[PDB]
Amino acid sequence: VKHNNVIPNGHFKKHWQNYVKTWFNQPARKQRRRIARQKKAVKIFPRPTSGPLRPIVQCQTRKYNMKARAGRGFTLEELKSAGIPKKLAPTIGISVDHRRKNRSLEGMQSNIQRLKTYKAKLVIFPRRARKVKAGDSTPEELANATQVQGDYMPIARGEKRSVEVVKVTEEMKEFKAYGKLRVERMNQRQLGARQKKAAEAEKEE
Amino acid sequence: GRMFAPTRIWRKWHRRVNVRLRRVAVASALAATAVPAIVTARGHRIESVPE
Amino acid sequence: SQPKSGLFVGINKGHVVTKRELPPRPSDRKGKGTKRVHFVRNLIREVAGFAPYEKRITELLKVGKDKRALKVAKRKLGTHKRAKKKREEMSSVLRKMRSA
RNA sequence: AAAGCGUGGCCUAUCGAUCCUUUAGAUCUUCGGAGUUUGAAGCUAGAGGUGUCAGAAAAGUUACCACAGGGAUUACUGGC
RNA sequence: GGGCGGAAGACAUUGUCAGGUGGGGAGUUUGGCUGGGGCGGCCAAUCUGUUAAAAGAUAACGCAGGUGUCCUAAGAUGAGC
RNA sequence: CCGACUUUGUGAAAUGA
RNA sequence: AAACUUUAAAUAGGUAGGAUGGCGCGGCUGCUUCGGUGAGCCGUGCCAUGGAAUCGGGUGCUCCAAGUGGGCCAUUUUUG
RNA sequence: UUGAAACACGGACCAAGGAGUCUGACAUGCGUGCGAGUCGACGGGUUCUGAAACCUGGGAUGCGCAAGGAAGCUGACGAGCGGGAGGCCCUCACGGGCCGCACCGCUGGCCGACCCUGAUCUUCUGUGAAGGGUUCGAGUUGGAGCACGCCUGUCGGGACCC
RNA sequence: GCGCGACCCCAGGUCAGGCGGGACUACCGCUGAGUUUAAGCAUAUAAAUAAGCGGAGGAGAAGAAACUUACAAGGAUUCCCCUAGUAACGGCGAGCGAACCGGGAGCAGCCCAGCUUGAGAAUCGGGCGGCUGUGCCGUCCGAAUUGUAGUCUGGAGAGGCGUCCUCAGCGACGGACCGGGCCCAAGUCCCCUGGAAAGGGGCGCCUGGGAGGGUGAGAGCCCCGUCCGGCCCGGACCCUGUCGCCCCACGAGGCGCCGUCAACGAGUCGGGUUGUUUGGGAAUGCAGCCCAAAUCGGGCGGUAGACUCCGUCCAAGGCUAAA
């Protein structure tokens, strides 16, 4: 090594020329995926091309906790309260995720509105030709059915930037927000030291 | 025997230009289509085109 | 239980959502012993007998030296969590054989 | 008494990196689900030592020898 | 007489750990300076005087020598001599 | 080379608990 | 008398030869003094014929980097 | 090589092949686009010669816009001076004054680490009016950065060739 | 002086059947180096690689949480981007180095064992026979009660009540996908050089066809071809499109309630020690030996330890395209 330069981190001491992966087939995968999507669309005509319905859920992880995304499936609670049986939901284009847990009414009603919307704008062909059973749909509106393409129920990733204009009140000015914000940090630090003295306060007195 | 430093498939074949720089270049090319002296310099026989 | 404080840092920090009580699931009874499995295990227990270290546990408990009872039970089984409850189970066997 | 003198020896030599261990100190910081609580991990300042002393952990032989080289380098001749 | 005939016998032995021995064997090293190298020595850290040519710097396996310590006083201060 | 655990079961005595 | 010196060359060595100076006035100081006594600074106003000779645009500032790190000859001083 | 015509080594001659290339990271310099932004690079839709081209997302993906600490954590409360390009004003002009970018030098302030300090207020352990520091920062008191290309250099890869 | 039944094991050129070897790109398992780098070298690195030994398919492997996380939490597997040359690991030297989150491609979840016909093996195979023939049916043997079929799989489930809601097959005709064959525009006009006109001049034509190739020299128009499509033949079809006859139940499912049961995989987990491996650090996986479970329990929450609480999942059986 020589004149002032970063300390190298070349991870090329193995036989990397046996494992170079080149991307010359990138246009090829694009075109093959496109072909596969056409031939799935024609087969699942007239089902929606995005597939079954997906829930609005929150991400994990402090960095993205506020940013909603499509999940994997509706929970059993949600299907039950929207009035759609467990074994029937995957049939009619509704995913089911028996592993999720509903921890909030805010989440449950948010997805219940999606179940109701999907059932509102859902059409179901009869299993046979003339026999129209319960849960079916009438021929007169069956006859205009199309294959919706793309995302038919979009999810907003963050709540919209809205900044209204309001009064600045006197008791709002008096609020020492930093002092507030240090007090609970102090309490979190002292949480053990407080409860210990409480424990022996009970144990002795 | 070999060639020196044999040619390898993982050269940089495709180079990248900024999307906005492509757009700027297409703007300059469209502008240059409009100037009769530029077309005639560039090698097109235009002595009878109307406008 | 009750929701977060709504303040980004501190005791019970986080963002406020009206929390919910989960319906009972299967696998919350996971491990809850049942009538017939208890019947089976209790029956087979005396038919098979007691493993030798478990007999040593019985001896040390009926002497009353619970510390060494736990110690040898731990050295046989492997971890304190299961040594403790093995000692509890064998103390149960000694109360149910000194009951009569 | 005071001015002052005193940050070792009247002055010029008499000594020591990284990692590891160990000690001193804060009623210090972390063990990342939350606490009590041993242990461990830190920060600052010392010691444990490298004498080849800017600091690898290290015995010979080859006349059975080998490869790279050297006329930077010996033995023969030549030269002063 | 439901024991093929003897012997040894829960000891040898089998497997896993544990310690010692183990150039039989493996892997590896075997510093530098140097009027060639080797042996010698340290001119490898380092101090004083000289060489050093009256500022500083200045070499040789140049020269005469020194250092790996000793000290609760042989440190600090004051006083007297 | 030897030590322990294992295959490794049975009952008997003498010394320690 | 290289490891002696009172004295003590020549040659070479350092510094200075102004505009980055000086004076007056009124302000600050937690320094300093017995003290406007100093030391230093700050604002302001005045002066300062360029303060020896000669010569001339400058590494003046910065960056990136090559090669080199075996030297040899000569006059003088000089070690074995 | 200090030194080659050397009694130093290679070369009998001809023809053809023959030795600093490619890739990754980084950096300076230069060019282009945008510029507190900048990248569409993995995907998606298109694409009537096309592995091209064009469109799309990004509301936070990379880097940049905040740094100091080991960490818990905290996180810039708004700058003056000397010399200065250049412009301006006055004078007949010589000369004088004003504003003075860049850069250089000097002194500070603020953030943070460590130390020091402590009115009030407060959830009693927190805050922090005032005051700090021969300390330390790859800080701030200048937003200039991102992407692409080229050369050069360092390093990893056969890595100039034998 | 026996005839019996079971077990276990023989021999059969018995009847019917499956195995072995080959190819190496990619894929799965074991085994497993050093040259090199560290300016030496011994841990490290090369590398969990090359070589060795095996096993498959059109893909293989994985796969439906004994997961991550600490969030407002999410939710099988696989791959790409980012995470990230980062946390960590390392004679803390050389170097080495993942994961969560997020965005995308594609997304499908399933079935067993166990308590559960006991008026009653309801199950399966084989020989023979028939027919409509990848099967169905009858008869006779055998397997099997040391358990075949059915119900169940934790998201549950089994029971009991209920208005209720949901289930069937066979034809035709295409489309779609695949292969193959045939066909398809226009100068060879006049002059000149030329061995040869495919060249030059002149007069013209095609073009949804000026890709390419042949033909005696730079051929759109001589030829095969290219564009537009047309026609016909054959396949697999098991995908859907509409027509037609066949009319869906007292069985099963779904939904609502109940509260009673609620059965869940062992030398396995788990622990010690050793070895290897990892980024995994008081130990990441695996493996050997020893110890060896639990049912108000068990595995995790990236620092060993005990107590309290909390978040989370249910292993030790199996199948599963797509990217």
Ligand SMILES: C[C@@H]1C[C@@H]([C@H](O)CC2CC(=O)NC(=O)C2)C(=O)[C@@H](C)C1
């Ligand atoms: C007895 C101990 C030995 C030595 C140290 O352990 C050797 C280390 C240091 C080093 O160079 N890297 C290593 O891996 C070895 C040290 O520090 C001394 C003070 C005292």
Ligand SMILES: [Mg+2]
């Ligand atoms: Mg003093």
Ligand SMILES: [Mg+2]
């Ligand atoms: Mg003294």
Ligand SMILES: [Mg+2]
């Ligand atoms: Mg002194």
Ligand SMILES: [Mg+2]
């Ligand atoms: Mg030391």
Ligand SMILES: [Mg+2]
């Ligand atoms: Mg933790």
Ligand SMILES: [Mg+2]
């Ligand atoms: Mg040295």
Ligand SMILES: [Mg+2]
């Ligand atoms: Mg040797």
Ligand SMILES: [Mg+2]
């Ligand atoms: Mg011999």
Ligand SMILES: [Mg+2]
């Ligand atoms: Mg040897």
Ligand SMILES: [Mg+2]
């Ligand atoms: Mg030598």
Ligand SMILES: [Mg+2]
């Ligand atoms: Mg010698």
Ligand SMILES: [Mg+2]
């Ligand atoms: Mg001199």
Ligand SMILES: [Mg+2]
């Ligand atoms: Mg001198």
Ligand SMILES: [Mg+2]
């Ligand atoms: Mg002088």
Ligand SMILES: [Mg+2]
């Ligand atoms: Mg020579």
